[PDB]
Every structure is written in C-alpha cells, then in structure tokens.
Amino acid sequence: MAYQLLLSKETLNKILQYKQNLEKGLATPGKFFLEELSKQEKSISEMDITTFTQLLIQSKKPQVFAESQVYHDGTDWTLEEESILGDVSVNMPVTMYNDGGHGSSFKNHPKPISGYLAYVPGALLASGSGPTSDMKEVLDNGKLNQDKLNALYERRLLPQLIHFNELARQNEKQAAITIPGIGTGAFSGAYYDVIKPYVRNALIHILEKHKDSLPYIDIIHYDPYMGDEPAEKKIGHMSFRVSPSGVVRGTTGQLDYPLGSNPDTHILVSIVAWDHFSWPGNDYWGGARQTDDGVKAASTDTMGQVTGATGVYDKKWGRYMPPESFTKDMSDWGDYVRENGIVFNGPVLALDKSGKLDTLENVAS
C-alpha cells in the first residue's frame, strides 16, 4: 500500500503484553478485534507480533465518533486495545490540493503541492460511557497532569518525527512540519477550555528533549485556532511558531509551506489529529469535510492512498471525491470501501530504543 504505520517502543510493550495475555487465556478480545481475527486463518499463537498489530489496526472502522460512540468494554474495543490503538500513527505521501482551510475559507493551490500527512491520534478525554485509557493515563483525580500528557504525546509523535527527519535526510532537504491543536477539539471533553496550553507545552517538551535526535526538522508551524498567544521560539536549531489562524489572520495554511520554507529547501509535512478507531479519513469517509482529520483527508489524496483508487478533486467544494466510475452511478468514500471490500492494513514499524524505525519482531528482541 501507500501508507505506513509507526508505533512507540512502549506501545510495542503494550502489544507484547496483550498478545501473551491473549495466548494464556488471561484476557478476551473486543468485538471488532474478534471479527477481524475470525477472517484470519492463524491463531494468536501462530502469527507473529506484526500480524497481531495488523489485525488490531484493521479493526478500525472508516468512520467512528470516539468521543461518544465507544463503550471501551467488550462491545467494541477493550481498554487494552484502546491503549494500544491510540499510540499507532500512520503517515503517507499526499498531493495537497488546497491550503487546508476549514469550511469555505480554503484556497485552491494553483499547482498542487507534494507533501506528507501524519495522522497521530490525540489524547482522548471524552466518552459517551466509561473512562478512556487516556483519561486514566493523564488525569490525577480529574486534574490534568502535564508530565503524563508530555509522555503520551511523545510516545505518539516521536516516531513520525524520526521518520520525517530521515525523509528530509534522504531528500537533501529539511522538514517543515505543521501541527494543529491536536486533541483540543471534542477529544478534550470537559477540558475543552484548559487543554490548549497543555498541548503547546507538550509539543515544546517533545521538541526540546529531542532537538539533537531530529537534526533535519527545521520549521515547526503550530496552529491551534485560538486560545494561545502568537509566538516564535528557538529550540536548538529549529524555529517553533505558534500562529493561531483565528488570532493572526494571514497565517500559512496547514497544507501550505510555512514562512521561510519552499519546495526547494523543505519537504512539507502536516500532523493530522487522528482518533483511536477510525481510518485516516474519519469524517470524510462519511462525506464530511469537517474537523482537522476530515479537512486534511479531503483536501489531499488520502483516500486514494488508502483505497488505491484514483479519485477526482472538486475545486468548488475543495474535496477529494471518489472515482468517476463509482460516482456516476450522495455516495462518499465509505460507500466505496463498503462496495469494494477495501480494508485498512499496512506495513508497521516500531521506534527502537536507539532511535531507528524497524520491524516489530526485530525491535522486540
């Protein structure tokens, strides 16, 4: 396929523990995990760990509202499955068709941009039922803890940072990375109006702890819509910029080169606020160009890279619409994956203790 999935070392420990728990009869899979396992000929003990994580990632449905529709028990996904799924991020090269503006504020690129998306699921502090695994991880008697949140966002973001550092290294360029207000939307739940500085501080901490591990990540353009002061900051060699699109107008778009970068000197990379249980598109699999996930997945060829089909870009609606062969006969991309039986499974790697992406079995040794 055209995408790749990265997980952290601690995520691989999570996976190892869950697999050796399922082998010992010590735990029980969730419903969707079981449905994906049933199609597999092998048992839990027969497959290697890579096939295990692949079948667990395949349990994701194209369109899910994790802030309400998930029970976190056995009905859909057990809590161990959730703590593993939230740490899995997926990157892919994309053709950015507009600047990534929300609603009808998007501006079409006259010559489309070649860049990279990195869907990373933010902290889930919202649910329609019981507590989430992230709620238990980062909350201390309902009080938000900045240290645990830093650890979480590092676990989930550092593999993609390493990957795109290596990509810029191989491209004879540096990396310009745009980051949105990840987890500051519905995922924040009751913490909607306190989470913005927590996310900003988590990002600054990740960057300053690994400034030397990321030699070729040069510009980092971080944009929550509001709730934060505009600022520039030096972190070793990299320039970290907080530029709220709602506060300071004229800010470069999420799918646009930040100030000081251009396709000859930087590769364009955009972190996309993902969730624990949907495909890279989420809302746009249902047809909606809404939320960060949906706007970015719709303004790029994400659906092409995930389904392998060649869609058409509608300039009026700023959309990556399904292929003509399908659309000529309101039918979105989830309709395509349902009608063509397309699944979500790809190559997976983990971040070594040394700091090198490698296969799951290799680093597990």
Binding site: G103, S104, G122, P180, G181, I182, G183, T184, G185, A186, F187, S188, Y192, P224, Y225, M226, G246, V272, A273, D283, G286, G287, A288, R289, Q290, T291, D292, D293, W317, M330
Partner: protein, 76 residues
C-alpha cells in the same frame, strides 16, 4: 414542509423549511428559535453530518424528518 430539530435543551422544535433551503438557512432558523449562532451548530441526520452549502434535498430529508443539533467547537 416542516421538519423537527432535537435541540440542546433536549426538547424538539418544529422548523419551516423547503427542500431548496441550504443547511445554512436551517442553521439561521435554529438560531432564530433557540439563539445558538450558526457558527456553533452541527447538524446531524441519521448519522450523516449535514454541512453548509448543501440543500436539504441533497440529503434526501423528507417531510417530517428530525435533525440532531450538536454543539460545534473548534480544534482537533
């Protein structure tokens, strides 16, 4: 044509609409009846996210359909 909106308050209001009325018009009418500005509104119907610019008939919303009102908020 009149439709229903299950509002934030938990009750259900009636709304005068036409198939050609865009989701924006529906949001303006919801603002007139309940006060919520359109920029804070998210309309759902049968799980499908209704988005501005599309008309009601673009979503095959019939005579007495009911729309869920959800609080829209910014971020990711």
């Amino acid at each position: 044509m009149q439709i229903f909106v299950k509002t934030l308050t938990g009750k259900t209001i009636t709304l005068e609409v036409e198939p050609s009325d865009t989701i924006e018009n529906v949001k303006a009418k919801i603002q007139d009846k309940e006060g919520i500005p359109p920029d804070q509104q998210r309309l759902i119907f049968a799980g499908k996210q209704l988005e501005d610019g599309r008309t009601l008939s673009d979503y095959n919303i019939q005579k007495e359909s009911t729309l869920h009102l959800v609080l829209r908020l910014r971020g990711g």
